[PDB]
């Protein structure tokens, strides 16, 4: 009988049930999207898009709905913070029901195409045997894809007949859904240009229509038909899997590095914005912009929005999680409540010291304070028998500006060390560690889990490409090698060409 | 060893599978509220 | 709600264990003659 790993091979020469099986997988996928959407709507907290956004609660499909213009709920709230909206039917609950109602209609279509498999359409009229003209099938399905690609960019993305897409400022502070005009210049190939994503689906959609029309009216060459086994349906699976894992590595990279298709207000910040201190530079640049215009130190740091200070902080780094640290980011450090303020450390001489920030590589990191040039002047010692830079002999104090503790100064060593321990993470925040019983151990954002999942899936599908690829080229020797081969087809210097009997 | 002549085959037709699956799925839906309590 | 923690695995095994018992007996009956 058939082994357990070959039970689904009964569909290779049964186009009806092959369609029925593909109808069932599509019914299963759409059913998950509706189920995963309903679960997220029941566990979501839309009451604070600043310090408790969706990417802090482990939302996976919610940002994908928000990316293409679905932002409101029937309950009356919006992921931007606006109340009093009316999203019509296409809300979060509507698109979830739309994927549930759809999932049932495929399940019924799968039953029909399964019972009535013996359709005359699936048979070659000249021979009366099952046959699918895959060459023309490719051009027909591509022609549809080119139409749906051009239509998605010409109407949905441009706002000509649709919502548009999610755009935002470079520092992810004022995100919204806006119609975008296509960018036909060289900057259209910038991954951080939303206009290029529009121009891509319009230009590639047109080329998809031309190519589809070509692959419909033009028959393949005789050699490439034979060399690629265009009669064997499994040659499509080999090449489709090959193109599939190609697209999986692309989305895995654009997610990790960041592009105009993965905003930071929908999946969090990226690893490299912490390495280059991308947020800290803008924060300080705005502090001197306030100080130069005559504002006090208390007023310069109070103008810093809490949303900007929440980005400049390591707990949101997607490279701080664990493989088995399950759950949302709020399960780790807690539910963010408020910005405590910007800490300023000074010794007894009165000069400002800066805490050395923790790199993403280190699970733990010591507390060391340098000065303006980097000379170590304070730390929390390990061995104290010969310590020279402890907080007491140096008189290290801490002052806050902006936030909750604005204007407050602490001088006792135990409490100054507490804030110095938090300064290695970035801007200090108050957390609610009790509502979810947070264990205080960092976790990664939806950006990391998507990157991890699709990068692993991409590598796994490489094996499928070469396996099903070798199944199509070595179909004759699938059950073994010719049982009357002879030590002459294999002998060296015999055949001039290896395996060519026409040259003795 | 000579085989045992007391051996018989077991059967469970399609209708008995539906009846059994219906019994334990309903007994579960009834008792689950008391398991969570 | 503060429900019992073992109630989940209690219901899950209460469904699964007798289910597979009937499934094994059925598939081994249709594979006969």
């Amino acid at each position: 009988g058939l082994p357990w790993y070959r039970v689904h091979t009964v569909l290779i020469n049964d186009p009806g049930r092959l369609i029925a099986a593909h109808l069932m997988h599509t019914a299963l996928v759409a059913g998950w999207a509706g189920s995963m959407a309903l679960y997220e709507l029941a566990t979501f907290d839309p009451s604070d898009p600043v310090l408790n956004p969706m990417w802090r609660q482990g939302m996976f499909v919610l940002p994908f709905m928000a990316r293409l213009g679905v932002t409101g709920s029937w309950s009356g709230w919006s992921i931007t913070g606006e109340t009093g909206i009316d999203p019509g039917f296409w809300s979060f609950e509507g698109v979830a029901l739309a994927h549930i109602v759809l999932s049932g209609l495929l399940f019924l279509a799968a039953c029909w195409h399964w019972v009535y498999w013996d359709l005359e359409l699936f048979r070659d009229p000249r021979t009366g045997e099952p046959a699918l003209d895959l060459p023309k099938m490719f051009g027909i399905h591509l022609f549809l894809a080119g139409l749906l690609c051009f239509g998605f960019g010409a109407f949905h993305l441009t706002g000509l007949f649709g919502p548009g897409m999610w755009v935002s400022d470079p520092y992810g502070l004022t995100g919204s859904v806006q119609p975008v005009a296509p960018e036909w210049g060289p900057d259209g190939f910038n991954p951080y240009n939303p206009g290029g994503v529009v121009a891509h689906h319009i230009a590639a959609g047109i080329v998809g229509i031309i190519a589809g029309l070509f692959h419909i009216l033009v028959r393949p060459p005789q050699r490439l038909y034979k060399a690629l086994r265009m009669g064997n349906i499994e040659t499509v699976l080999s090449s489709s899997i090959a193109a599939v894992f190609f697209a999986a590595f692309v989305v895995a990279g654009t997610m990790w590095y960041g592009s105009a298709t993965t905003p930071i207000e929908l999946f969090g910040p990226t690893r490299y914005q912490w390495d280059s201190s991308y947020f800290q530079q803008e924060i300080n640049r705005r502090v001197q912009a306030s100080l130069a215009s005559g504002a006090t130190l208390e007023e310069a740091w109070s103008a810093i929005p809490e949303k900007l200070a929440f980005y400049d902080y390591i707990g949101n780094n997607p490279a701080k999680g664990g493989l088995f640290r399950t759950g949302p980011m709020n399960k780790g450090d807690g539910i963010a409540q408020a910005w405590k303020g910007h800490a300023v450390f000074r010794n007894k001489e009165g000069e400002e010291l800066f805490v050395r920030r923790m790199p993403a590589f280190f699970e733990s990191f010591p507390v060391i304070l340098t000065d303006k040039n980097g000379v170590v002047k304070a730390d929390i010692p390990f061995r104290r028998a010969e310590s020279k830079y402890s907080f007491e002999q140096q008189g290290v104090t801490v002052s806050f500006y902006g936030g909750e503790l604005n204007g407050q100064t602490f001088t006792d060593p135990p409490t100054v060390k507490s804030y110095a321990r938090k300064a290695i993470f970035g801007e200090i925040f108050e957390f609610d560690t009790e509502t979810l019983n947070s264990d205080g151990i960092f976790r990664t954002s939806p950006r990391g889990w998507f990157t991890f999942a699709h990068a692993v899936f991409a590598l796994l599908f490489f094996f499928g490409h070469i396996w099903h690829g070798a199944r199509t080229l070595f179909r004759d020797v699938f059950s073994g090698i010719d049982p009357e081969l002879s030590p002459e087809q294999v002998e060296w210097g015999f055949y001039q060409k290896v395996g060519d009997v026409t040259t003795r | 060893m000579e085989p045992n002549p007391n051996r018989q085959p077991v059967e469970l037709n399609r209708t008995s599978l539906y009846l059994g699956l219906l019994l334990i799925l309903v007994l579960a839906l009834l008792f689950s509220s008391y398991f969570f309590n | 709600m503060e429900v019992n923690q073992l109630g989940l695995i209690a219901t899950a095994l209460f469904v699964l264990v007798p289910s597979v018992f009937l499934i094994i007996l059925y598939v081994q009956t249709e594979s006969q003659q």
Partner: peptide, 30 residues
């Protein structure tokens, strides 16, 4: 976890209805 457990059992009983009707063992006469 409770709400998901109740609706999952409810969905199985409804799925069980679809097979017990359209995929029953045909009664035949002789």
């Amino acid at each position: 976890m409770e709400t998901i457990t109740y609706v999952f059992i409810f969905a199985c009983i409804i799925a069980l209805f679809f097979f017990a009707i359209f995929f029953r063992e045909p009664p035949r006469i002789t």
